[PDB]
Write a protein that binds this DNA or RNA. Structure first.
Lengths: 224, 239, 60, 232, 467, 221
RNA sequence: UAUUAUUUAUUUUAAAA
């Protein structure tokens, strides 16, 4: 029995707890999760491995003699629906491996396309100005398409300023992430003609994008 | 002090020396073994200078790396207590330091074989504890002796000497009081040769008088090289 | 800066530079003569690595 | 038909006839209208009707099929780093862009070497690329290292008039005084070389003086006075 | 279409690799240690190996004192007025041998062939003195070229090479030749700091010899050599003596001559050894065609091969090597790495699959298609043949949990102003107003903007068709 | 009447010198060149605007002078056809032509005219043409005057800087680039000088078009 | 994986066949 709301410092439960139910004693294995930490406390000269919450929100328990994933999600259940923690959720939720992100092409190299991660999955997502919190990745030429990976042309697949929906591969070199677009649902999802100097273009073929009003066509690596 | 005789008819200056006599020259090597690769405590007259050479070492940032030679950085720190009146830091006083530091870098980068030490940097940290005239020449002597202690290969010695011209009489190793009353020339003589690596004239000197001042300047600088050379002989034989 | 020898038949080593068919010193130390290798061993000097040295180093 | 034009002026070509876009005119990606952006003489050629503006400029912009004189400023594993003009963006010169190239053999070009190349890629969003042999026609004669000699800085209009227009009397008035070999780059560079240095020096001073004096009829008196001065 | 010269050798080709490399040396001229003691196997637990002969010579011999001083460079011989001297008979070898004994400097270079030969074969030796240029047919004098040890080991004669890190190995393996007095102009160019350390850079700059450099990977076994290849071969050593004079004077002025001569001795001291008898520790003085405990591991990373298929690339790399030794071919001739990766990626079951691959198979794979198919099938059937909480519950058990919970319960029994100056001005929420026609402000309610927010988000995602 | 020259400086792509009354401004343009990491724009051209005073160091006064000069030249340049490039526009005020401690409109107006001419000499893609004039109204007799002298500024109620955009032979006023007004004025005086300024800028571009044509035409063929 | 690599390149052994 734990209080629903929690503050950083409120003791939740030790790593071991028992209770008699239906004449069958069970022992709970409480492991730390996102929002807790094992803190030793002293009241009579003997230590104990208790779990102490370190976030502002509600406590939630899950399962994988079983183990219990004791964690604290930040914010109130009414605040999560209003999404009042959009800026805090972007920085705290780093893009793990295998995630899907929405980036923006900022630099085109002959063998790579430097992008800037703007969102990430949580379809719901999470996105944060002078905040100073932004991630960046690199879309290598070998990860642009699945059909004929080597010997491609990134100038015909991306342009600076285009929005690209790409799935991450792994942490590139610590400085940058490694993304890929070798799927039909991955690629340019929002671009504009003449590097933003034209009209809003829309995806048509697997490698063709066109604007309705201007009628101009430009080759990309679309997603549909 | 007060109103004094600069060069009496008896050939005596205000501090007792004569026209061709240097101030007392007490140099020291390896004074900071656990803080730098080269150390030289220069004590020329009342001038007290600490010169520290740190290198050749890897640059802290690759933004200052040369793939064909070493980089030479000279940092001159003039303490607030180098004079009688504790001088306060002035925005104008920072420009004179940069000119001295640049003149020192350009001087020793031509004499120190930087090609032998590629992809490296050589930091020269200088602390002036007291000054009493001829400070520019004494800074040169501290760098030369500190580089030799660090085993840095050079072509020859670089001797620093300051010469003043009073009326028609040149005076060697000018002190603070003499610099306030006459024109001063600092010289950077290379070894026993008559070649100059530095020549600073910061006051008016007649053109017909400059020829003789340089001759007596390079001559007295050879004597400074001897005093520095002998100190290295005694420090090498006793160790 | 001083002259170590005026014999052109020598192989200049460390602490030594060639100039005008004559040989001068670049550091302050003792003169070394091994076969025909003329060099000067300076007093203070950092570690000079050579092939086959069991060293201990720290990753930078 | 040649007339002086200004930016924002009305383009004196009816939108009915298809016209090719050249250097000087700009097609707005929004309003789709063709409007000038530079200041100079407008040219229209009466099969295909192209139009461009001849504007005065000194900052070279890389364009494909252009012969340029570059300076090697960086050696790497598979390509050189070449500078076509000071302060501009550097261009790429691959090691395989040479006659008889090989992956197991590095070219004998160092930094500071002058090369006469051809721009083979000029993407606005990418780094420009050059090559020392035409990848389209297989040419290689004239491309490569420009040994010795002297390089000259001229405006882009003076360099283009010297390479294309055969009526430009600069090459002819120079041959009347000395034999030489010239390489003209569209990036505002002119490389000359003679047997004796005194002849190359007079060629440098003439091309310098003829570039600022736009009077084409004065080129004869410039070379006459310049070659006569070096004899003193 | 080219006959293998290995078939015409008087001494057979022994690719068995069943004993340490025995030097092909029978006489040791210009020696300080006797040859009778240089054939004792040196075993330091490294396998027992024959020591590199002339090693004591290169270590303890001094060059001529003339090399130390600077002399004026002598112009190389005229290129358009000179001709090579072909040496293919035993009589023509002695005429050149007695000419190389009467000189001070020589420029030597070799050509090699490794595609249709396991260890490889030397195909041409290029020797040139200050007077003439020689081209030696090392395929017909393979047993006769050991006479050159009188000149190649004479300290009074300088052997000018360029990148002799392989020529030293080729001389001792195929010709039994060793160099005492080496001057590698590669280490001379590397010490000076030239941008390119190649021989083409030294020709185009110091010799002013503009040359096309494509006759390197050519087949030097063919006879007679073509006119372009004869002119290319003589050019590798014709100007190397003039280049030697220029680079030597610069090394003296730069005080780098001592380092070049030191590195040159380390190049001449290189010892060839079979891969089976190679030292376990990497050394820059011993050479082996294979210098790794598992050469197929770098192929699995180069071609991205799963680690579970390592037993396959092991049995294919070892089979490919034994076949190359049997027919005296290179491993790439019987099966290149491009085809080796396809066999482990596609795993051809039937015999037809081994023959039909996109790149195309070699003739050794074509003949051994049944054997290779039986190998991949067997190795794949061996892959299919191959494929907690009570630790902490016993320490504390269950009845002792009531103690740690009672410890918890009674340990933690020990667990409004509106504003002062800025508390009622800063935490204020947003208030939006609108000026009416009479100029009076009208505050919109927080529910009016709520209507606007839900009306935009609902009307935004409601776009699924555009004409 | 105003004086103006083109192509005066050697080591830059385009230079100019604009003179009005006593205000003299020399401007230089270099571009497109390699931008710095903190300057490059992924899709369009980056501008580096620098104005330096005639006396003393560059203070915050020239910082707002840069910001206004930047707002005029930015829509006047086809930035999108120079992606990931830099243009350095540097204006040097030789003589202020006015009391620097009180007014700064005569220098802003000349920097606009000098920058536009220097951009023409450099070869940057310009969407149109531009003209700038200073405007003031006198206290005693509320009279609108164009290009006022230094003495008239010290006797004025409000000062104005009008920068217009001209297209099609310099007759169609496409837009009003900059109208900077300070002092005392009402809605009636604004449109009175705005209408008066539109015809004084209209004869400025007509004179500017003549100035640049007299210089560029001898260069070309 | 130094006969390997760095793309507006921090590689500092590209030499031999």
């Amino acid at each position: 029995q734990f209080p629903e709301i929690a503050y950083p410092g409120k003791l939740i439960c030790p790593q071991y707890g028992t209770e008699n139910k239906d004449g069958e004693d069970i022992i709970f294995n409480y492991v730390p999760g996102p929002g807790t930490k094992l803190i030793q406390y002293e009241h009579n000269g003997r230590t104990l491995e208790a779990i102490t919450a370190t976030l502002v929100g509600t406590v939630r328990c899950e399962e994988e003699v079983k183990n219990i994933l004791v964690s604290v999600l930040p914010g109130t259940e009414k605040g999560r629906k209003t999404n009042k923690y959009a800026n805090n959720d972007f920085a705290n939720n780093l893009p793990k491996e295998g995630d899907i992100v929405l980036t923006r092409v900022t630099r085109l190299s002959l063998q790579r396309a430097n992008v800037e991660i703007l969102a990430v999955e949580d379809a719901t997502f999470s996105v944060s100005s002078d905040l100073g919190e932004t991630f960046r990745g690199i879309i290598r030429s070998q990860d642009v398409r699945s059909t004929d990976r080597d010997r491609v042309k990134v100038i015909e697949c991306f342009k600076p300023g285009d929005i690209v929906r790409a799935q991450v591969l792994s942490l590139g070199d610590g400085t940058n992430y490694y993304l890929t677009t070798a799927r039909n649902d991955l690629g340019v999802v929002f671009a504009r003609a003449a590097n933003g100097a034209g009209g809003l273009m829309y995806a048509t073929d697997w490698q063709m994008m066109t604007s309705p009003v201007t009628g101009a066509t430009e080759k990309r690596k679309c997603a549909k | 002090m007060s109103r004094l005789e600069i060069y009496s008819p008896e050939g005596l200056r205000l501090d007792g020396r004569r026209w061709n006599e240097l101030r007392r020259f007490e140099s020291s090597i390896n004074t900071h073994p656990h803080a730098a690769d080269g150390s030289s405590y220069m004590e020329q007259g009342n001038n007290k200078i600490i010169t520290l050479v740190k290198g050749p070492k890897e640059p802290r940032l690759k933004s200052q790396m040369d793939t064909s030679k070493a980089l030479l950085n000279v940092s001159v720190n003039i303490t607030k207590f180098s004079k009688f009146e504790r001088s306060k830091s002035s925005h104008k006083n920072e420009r004179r330091v940069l000119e001295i530091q640049t003149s020192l870098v350009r001087m020793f980068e031509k004499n120190v074989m930087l090609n032998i030490y590629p992809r490296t940097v050589i930091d020269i940290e200088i602390h002036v504890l007291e000054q009493d005239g001829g400070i520019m020449g004494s800074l040169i002597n501290g760098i030369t002796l500190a580089l030799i202690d660090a085993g840095i290969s050079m072509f020859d010695y670089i001797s620093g000497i300051s010469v003043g011209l009073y009326d028609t009489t040149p005076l060697l190793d000018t002190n603070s009081l003499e610099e306030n009353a006459m024109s001063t020339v600092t010289l950077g003589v290379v070894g026993k040769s008559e070649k100059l690596s530095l020549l600073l004239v910061e006051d008016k000197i007649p053109l017909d008088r400059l020829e003789n001042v340089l001759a007596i300047g390079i001559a007295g600088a050879h004597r400074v090289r001897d005093l520095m050379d002998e100190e290295l002989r005694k420090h090498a034989q006793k160790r | 800066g001083e002259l170590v020898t005026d014999d052109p038949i020598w192989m200049r080593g460390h602490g030594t530079y060639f100039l005008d068919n004559m040989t001068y010193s670049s550091v302050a130390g003792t003169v070394s003569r091994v076969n025909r290798l003329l060099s000067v061993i300076p007093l203070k000097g950092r570690y000079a690595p050579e092939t086959g040295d069991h060293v201990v180093g720290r990753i930078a | 038909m040649s007339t002086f034009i200004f930016p924002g002026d009305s383009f004196p070509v009816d939108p009915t006839t298809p016209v090719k876009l050249g250097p000087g005119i700009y097609c707005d990606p929004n309003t789709q209208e063709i409007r000038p952006v530079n200041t100079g003489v407008l040219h229209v050629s009466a099969g295909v009707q192209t139009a461009y503006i001849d504007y005065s400029s000194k900052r070279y912009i890389p364009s494909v099929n252009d012969f340029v004189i570059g300076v090697i400023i960086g050696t790497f594993s598979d390509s050189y780093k070449v500078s076509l003009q000071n302060f501009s963006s550097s261009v790429s010169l691959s090691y395989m862009a040479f006659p008889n190239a090989s992956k197991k053999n590095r070219p004998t070009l160092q930094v500071g070497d002058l090369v006469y190349a051809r721009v083979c890629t000029a993407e606005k969003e990418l780094e420009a690329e050059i090559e020392c042999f035409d990848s389209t026609t297989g040419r290689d004669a004239g491309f490569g290292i420009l040994e010795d000699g002297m390089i000259i800085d001229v405006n882009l209009n003076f360099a283009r008039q010297l390479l294309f227009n055969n009526d430009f009397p600069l090459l002819k008035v120079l041959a009347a005084h000395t034999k030489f070999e010239v390489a003209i780059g569209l990036n505002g560079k002119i490389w000359v070389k003679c047997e004796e240095l005194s002849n190359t020096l007079a060629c440098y001073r003439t091309i310098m003086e003829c570039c600022q004096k736009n009077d084409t009829a004065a080129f004869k008196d410039i070379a006459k006075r310049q070659f006569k001065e070096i004899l003193t | 279409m080219v006959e293998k010269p290995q078939l015409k050798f008087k001494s057979p080709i022994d690719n068995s690799e069943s004993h340490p490399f025995i030097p092909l040396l029978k006489e040791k001229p210009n020696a300080l240690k006797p040859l009778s003691e240089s054939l004792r196997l040196v075993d330091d637990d490294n396998p027992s190996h024959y020591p590199h002969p002339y090693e004591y010579e290169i270590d303890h011999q001094e060059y001529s004192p003339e090399i130390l001083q600077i002399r004026e460079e002598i112009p190389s011989k005229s290129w358009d007025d000179s001709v090579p001297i072909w040496v293919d008979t035993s009589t023509e070898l002695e005429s050149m041998l007695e000419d190389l004994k009467n000189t001070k400097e020589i420029a030597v270079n070799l050509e090699h062939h490794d595609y249709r030969s396991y260890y490889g074969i030397v195909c041409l030796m290029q020797i040139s003195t200050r007077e003439r240029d020689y081209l030696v047919d090392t395929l017909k004098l393979r047993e006769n070229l050991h006479i050159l040890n009188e000149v190649f080991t004479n300290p009074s004669i300088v052997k000018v090479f360029h990148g002799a890190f392989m020529d030293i190995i080729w001389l001792q393996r195929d010709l039994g030749l060793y160099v005492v007095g080496l001057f590698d102009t590669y280490h001379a160019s590397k010490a000076i700091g030239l941008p390119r350390h190649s021989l083409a850079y030294l020709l185009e700059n110091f010799a002013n010899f503009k040359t096309s450099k494509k006759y390197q990977l050519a087949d030097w076994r063919i006879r007679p050599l073509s006119k372009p290849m004869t002119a290319y071969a003589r050019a590798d050593t014709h100007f190397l003596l003039n280049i030697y004079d220029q680079l030597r004077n610069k090394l003296i002025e730069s005080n780098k001559l001592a380092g070049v001569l030191y590195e040159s001795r380390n190049v001449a001291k290189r010892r060839f050894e079979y891969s089976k008898y190679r030292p376990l520790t990497p050394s820059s003085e011993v050479y082996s065609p294979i210098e790794k405990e598992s050469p197929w591991k770098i192929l699995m990373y180069q071609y991205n091969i799963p680690p579970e298929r390592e037993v396959l690339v092991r049995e294919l790399y070892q089979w490919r090597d034994l076949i190359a030794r049997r027919d005296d071919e290179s491993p790439r001739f019987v099966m290149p790495n491009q085809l080796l990766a396809a066999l482990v990626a596609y795993t051809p079951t039937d015999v037809i699959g081994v023959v039909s691959l996109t790149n195309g198979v070699t003739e050794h794979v074509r003949q051994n298609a049944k054997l290779l198919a039986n190998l991949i099938r067997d190795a794949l059937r061996n892959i299919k043949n191959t494929n907690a909480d009570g630790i902490l519950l016993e320490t504390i058990s269950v009845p002792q949990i009531r103690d740690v919970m009672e410890r918890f319960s009674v340990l933690c029994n020990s667990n409004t102003n509106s504003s002062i100056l800025l508390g009622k001005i800063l935490p204020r929420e947003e208030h939006d107003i609108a000026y009416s026609k009479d100029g009076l402000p009208n505050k919109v309610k927080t529910e009016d903007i709520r209507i606007r927010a839900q009306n935009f988000k609902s009307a935004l995602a409601n776009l699924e068709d555009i004409i | 009447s105003v004086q103006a020259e083109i192509g005066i400086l050697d080591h830059v792509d385009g230079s100019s010198e604009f003179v009005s009354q006593d205000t003299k401004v020399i401007c230089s343009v270099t571009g497109p060149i390699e931008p710095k990491a903190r300057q490059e724009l992924p899709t369009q051209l980056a501008l580096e605007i620098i104005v330096r005073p005639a006396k003393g160091v560059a203070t915050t006064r020239e910082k707002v002078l840069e910001d206004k000069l930047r707002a005029v030249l930015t829509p006047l340049i086809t930035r999108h056809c120079y992606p990931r490039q830099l243009c350095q526009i540097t204006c040097q005020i030789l003589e202020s032509g006015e009391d620097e401690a009180e007014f700064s409109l005569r220098e802003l107006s000349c920097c606009i005219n000098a920058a536009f001419l220097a951009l023409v000499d450099a070869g940057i893609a310009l969407n149109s043409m531009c003209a700038s004039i200073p405007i003031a109204i006198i206290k005693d007799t509320s009279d609108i005057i164009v290009d006022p002298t230094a003495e008239q500024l010290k006797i004025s109620l409000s000062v104005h800087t009008l920068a217009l955009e001209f297209v099609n032979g310099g007759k169609v006023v496409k837009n009003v680039l900059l109208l900077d007004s300070n002092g005392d004025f009402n809605e009636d005086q604004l449109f009175s000088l705005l209408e008066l300024g539109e015809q004084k800028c209209q004869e400025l571009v007509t004179n500017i078009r003549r100035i640049i044509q007299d210089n560029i035409s001898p260069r070309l063929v």
